Amino acid sequence: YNVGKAEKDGEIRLKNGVAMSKEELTREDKNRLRRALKRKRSKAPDSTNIKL
Amino acid sequence: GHTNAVQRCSFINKQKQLISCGADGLIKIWDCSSGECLKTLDGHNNRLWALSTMNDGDMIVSADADGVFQFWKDCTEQEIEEEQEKAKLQVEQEQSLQNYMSKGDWTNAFLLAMTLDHPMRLFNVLKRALGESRSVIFNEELDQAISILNDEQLILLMKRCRDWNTNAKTHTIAQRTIRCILMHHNIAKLSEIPGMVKIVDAIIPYTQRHFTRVDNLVEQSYILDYALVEMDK
Amino acid sequence: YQRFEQAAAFGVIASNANCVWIPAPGQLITSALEDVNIWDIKTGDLVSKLSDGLPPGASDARGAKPAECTYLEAHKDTDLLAVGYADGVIKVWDLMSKTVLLNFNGHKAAITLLQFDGTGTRLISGSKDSNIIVWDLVGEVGLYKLRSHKDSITGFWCQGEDWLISTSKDGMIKLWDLKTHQCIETHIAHTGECWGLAVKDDLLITTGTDSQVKIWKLDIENDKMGGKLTEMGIFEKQSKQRGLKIEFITNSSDKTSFFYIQNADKTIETFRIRKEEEIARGLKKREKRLKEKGLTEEEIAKSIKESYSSFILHPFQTIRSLYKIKSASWTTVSSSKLELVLTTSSNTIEYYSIPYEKRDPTSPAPLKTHTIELQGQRTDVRSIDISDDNKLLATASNGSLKIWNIKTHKCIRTFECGYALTCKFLPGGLLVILGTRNGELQLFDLASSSLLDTIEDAHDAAIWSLDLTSDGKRLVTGSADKTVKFWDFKVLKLHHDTTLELTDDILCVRVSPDDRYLAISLLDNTVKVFFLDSMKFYLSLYGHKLPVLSIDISFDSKMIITSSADKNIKIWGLDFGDCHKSLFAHQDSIMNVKFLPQSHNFFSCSKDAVVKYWDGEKFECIQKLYAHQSEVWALAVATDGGFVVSSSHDHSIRIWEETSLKAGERLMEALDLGIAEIEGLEAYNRDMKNAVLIAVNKTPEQYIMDTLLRIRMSQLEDALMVMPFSYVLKFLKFIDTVMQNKTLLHSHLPLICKNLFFIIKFNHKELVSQKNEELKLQINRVKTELRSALKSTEDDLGFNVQGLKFVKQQWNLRHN
What we know:
This is part of a larger assembly, with chains A (52 residues), B (233 residues) and C (816 residues). Helices cover 58% and strands 18% of the residues of chain B. Chain B contains 9 helices and 7 strands, in the order βββββββααααααααα. Chain C: Belongs to the WD repeat WDR3/UTP12 family.
């Protein structure tokens, strides 16, 4: 057995074995995690209107 | 959007909506302003020739060619009230949870983060609560709380402990939680729950790896005997 | 070249911000874009004007539009004013000195609400970025941030240091603990957004998007963990639009409490809070009415809860205005009357009084006793002009024509008109002619201060363009009826002369200074040139993707500019009609382009709120002028060229006048430092029998241990390998200190073990050399706790695996 992706759509589980519910994640943590993923992915006419 | 011929058409909710009957036996509720099917009711298996409405469509009566009547009752406000209460109860749970962590009421906090299904908090509940235990397995209150968990409640936890067990930096928290469950529950009931065995499959090898390790560390401790006996000389 | 500079701005009474009233009807402080007005309601004159400085156009001036003030808050006792700007900057102003005292920058978006504390030493700010920051005025620092709300902060209440209630655009109401900097309670105020919040003692009222108005009681000291806010009842206001502001006032003489709900529409709905005796009287009175109706005791009780809101609240009166209301505030409360002041979105201040006796008001409608309207225009200016003497500025807008003094900036005369589109002065500066959207031609006189003549049937559609010959006797006008009509002056009245029928709508008509050429812009993306003397077709220019918007001809009648909605300024030559150059001037449609007199340098204003001054020879933009907040509809140039005047969608008329430690080593000092604390702490003990650590705010053992984790494993062994022996002995002392801390060791037992073992291997022959008997005892203790600490772990591991195996077998037997 090896830890994989989230079964629930609202969770992030990393290969470290830590699962992350999006609800409890703070906004700043969510931002970096989104950026963290991105790095992983990256290398992988009318006269009146015209006048006025 | 109807598969077959539309036989009846009646307005409900003033000018806002329309209801139609089709030979397919499906009742489709549409929005007149947008012309989109908001809801589909399927209580019949044959063509529908009659449709009676009352109180702007609050009561809808549809008769089947087979001879079946469906008395549909509007309940939109009923459900909307339910979701509002669920959201309201939902909101109360986080705020109750967060304060519990700040106050240090871990035994109850275990219940809240579990119900909200919050891994970091849950992992944080057990981790620092265990630290207080260092200062039966965790404490009398939390241990009892673990006992009362139901089968699905138990399904969630060993999923987490399995994942935690894989990482050597976090296995120790997982092991004690597994220890608490085995000693505060009937193992016969555990084996009966579906999914335990497959989750239990993954826990054996990693636990053995941890057992093989640590045992080796105690070996490396015995360097110290050589220091004492030698430095005693 | 020489530089253009903003000499002065005017025409704004109240911008998109709140209004602060101060007692002497007294004065009112209102917003004018980047600057703040102080009006005198009685006289209706501007008392003082608060401007930071750095007028737009200076070399030091910034290259972007100034941030407009969004909220005004004044602390009456200390005579300080806090101004919040669209960029999230707070400037505390000295009202007497009319200068900035402090500058705070902690918000990334526009500020939504400011509030001084009762004592006036701390300031609370809410912004669109969903953060609340409490500033320390004396300390000039932000004490802390509250970051739970998920949208713009609409309102909040804090009348005591202990607690803060915050409302946000996410529909949420939150209670904060100022001593813990945490949110204590969380409830969904409304299904969508939450816009209003006013608190009086336990009573709390909030307004959502719809007409629903909720009621909450505030039991701060409940300490149940829930029900500090409990929803009591819901009452529906008359207005179906959102309620923006709610604010309470009490009458000292009678303790009578009133409030309003500022709606998004043109209505303010005032309410009264019934007294306990009235509620007790009303509760008894409603009981008999239901009882005589035959309702059961359980039915009547439920009915009271259903109508609970009605018992406390009494709709008092509704204020109706001619324009949408932007802000409101109570001015004075008395038994005789109740008075309010408000600002509309149409650039005016209105003052209302409500005479009342006991429960109900005396008059059917409120009394509008005062207004400030003369120094502004209700609608945006569509066209402006300058008199040939360069003293009078006439600004034609929808419904009114106002004329200003460029020096004193005070409107001299006002004239009611239709939907005015184009205005320009006549020679001598004594007459003005307007072209309305209704096809009407209106002529005005300043000395008579009245309209001379109106031609209702001048055109079948809007009079979009209008001009005059240099002699001033002949008029040329363009209209959407696809015609150009020539008119003359005969003693004064207008006579039709000739009609030139074109193929499409006409967007501009310009006459050359020499009266030889006439340029006519058409909706078919072309500009049509004639010979004025004979009206013979001369030239047609092509190249604009979108219809032309403004045409100007050089003073020498050689060069002509054409601006269009395609964001391009194209410069043409009348000799052949060739395009010498096309300039991508602005980011949006360009409204007006004017040559500077006696020169080919020209201007350009566009919808992107930028005024650009160009070189007519080098085809380069010499200067960018960022002063306006919105579209610049009109532009005019002085005859002498000394200044250029611009009016924008923001109701502002602006005049521009012419002027190292290696890894592992750090572990050595970090190790040594905490040790000295340990012996220092021990030194105090046998007697009974540092700065950095205090900044760290962790135990020396914690601080050393935190360092050890920080060291990377790849370099750990070598850092432990660089370790001096006498220093190594101290590391053993540290491990001892960890050992008395059982919990900390258990948290990080494995990492400690590897480091110890390597060190003992590292200096094994040195350790045996040491003969300190006390050092034996330190060694001995380290195990028996470590061995027990370890021994527990394998036992827990051993317990789990054995039972975990057993459960596996049982199921296997059951299923096999």
